[PDB]
Nucleic acid binder design. Sequence first.
RNA 1: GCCUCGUAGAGG
RNA 2: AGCCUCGUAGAGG
Lengths: 260, 262
Amino acid sequence: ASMPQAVVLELVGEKPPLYPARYAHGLFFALLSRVSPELAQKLHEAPRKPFTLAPLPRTLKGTLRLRLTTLDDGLFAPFLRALLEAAPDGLPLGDSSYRLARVLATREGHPLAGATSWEELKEAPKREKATFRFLTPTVFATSKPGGRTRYTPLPDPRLIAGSLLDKWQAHSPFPYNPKEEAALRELFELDLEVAGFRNLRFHRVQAGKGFFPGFTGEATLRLWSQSLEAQEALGRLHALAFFSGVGAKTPYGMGLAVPL
Amino acid sequence: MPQAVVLELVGEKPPLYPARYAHGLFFALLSRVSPELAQKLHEAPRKPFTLAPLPGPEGATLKGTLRLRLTTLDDGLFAPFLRALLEAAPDGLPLGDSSYRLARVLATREGHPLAGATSWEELKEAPKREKATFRFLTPTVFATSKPGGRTRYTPLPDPRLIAGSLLDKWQAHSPFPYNPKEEAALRELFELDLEVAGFRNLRFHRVQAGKGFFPGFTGEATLRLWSQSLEAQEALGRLHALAFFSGVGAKTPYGMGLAVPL
RNA sequence: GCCUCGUAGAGG
RNA sequence: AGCCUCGUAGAGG
């Protein structure tokens, strides 16, 4: 209903989108604004957006699979409307139209789709360790004093957690109070460590108009704090990843993380 | 001269804790010949050497054969060792339950690629770099302990920590240490201008070293300086070069941190 | 993830 | 398009 969700769309068309990540971004806003141009404009401007847009990796040429997550309540409905209204004439990526061959909103329909209530997410079993699968290049913006554009394309436990928290606070109905948030970032930069990782890989990808370095693979974060407040906070964020994504550029295909 | 010698030891059975036993032999031998050295070294918190049992395109090892890579960081350390080693050899070189047999002393880059000798001045005069690639041949880890007696390891190629370590070493052993200001200038630049440019064949490991088990990574990692400061570009050159002799990170005396500049 | 140095990186 | 906006560490197009 007004729950976070993930859906996957097969866009079967004649040729591969020249810039799937980018064109998918356009398709989204074009769609979303057919219905409500205020939502489009206001959303567009937001520094923190409650949605992700990711061409899934690894299909046939001419076909594209888009994962769309949403955190807001008012985002899904207009999209659904535009989609239903849009679908019959095909959805346009760039200068071609693709046929909505499939819509996979069911967990059983695709392992990367489904929904959950904020209450479920929030009542996630507490964790002392959390593994993530980063399916598409994941990068953090680690900028510095001066005009210093800098990137961290590796699974820094602090930054991972940092994003999932920043994201939670921004888009969650049950946000922590400043004290708790402070006592979380603290317990993170104190008791978080890299328990391990599999199939790490470094990439340079066009995330929209530009190219960014990112990593993929799996990483396990461990938390030495027995402090129960921090433990179940990890549980919440670990679940949230499935919908919020991780780090920077989630609207452009990057940061597709998945809780293991 | 910081030298790097590979030692082939032949024995009955592959050693139980090679890195720990090797560590013991180094001092035992160093102590019999130069028993004041052994004491001083063991005291220092940054020892001017590395000891690492080697681990690809050299095919199958024979059961019982072992390779020790010894790198010395000051001109004093290597000379006696050989001498000590040499004398103890005919007897049988013992690490653990069993004695092994010195079969080769490979101290020339032509005998083993990880072997060789370079001059402090040569390192110093290493061409400046905008990018530095390293190949970590053995699990490499950093100690990033936090307040309150918390022990934390970062088994990742943190460009800060990779460079930071190499410097910290350069400062400890080199006859040409940066001054307290030249130094802190680099450290600020290193946090500010150092990025990860790429990496290859990264892999997590959990290994035995010292009195403990530690995590650590292996593979390649290209660093990149986004600054234009020649102070730093050259520093990168010096540090990139010393990696061959100094290692990178914690537990280099116990087999971790075998870094190699490509 | 034991001991030691003290804050963050290290030594056995 | 290591470019633009935000200005301190992380983000948005």
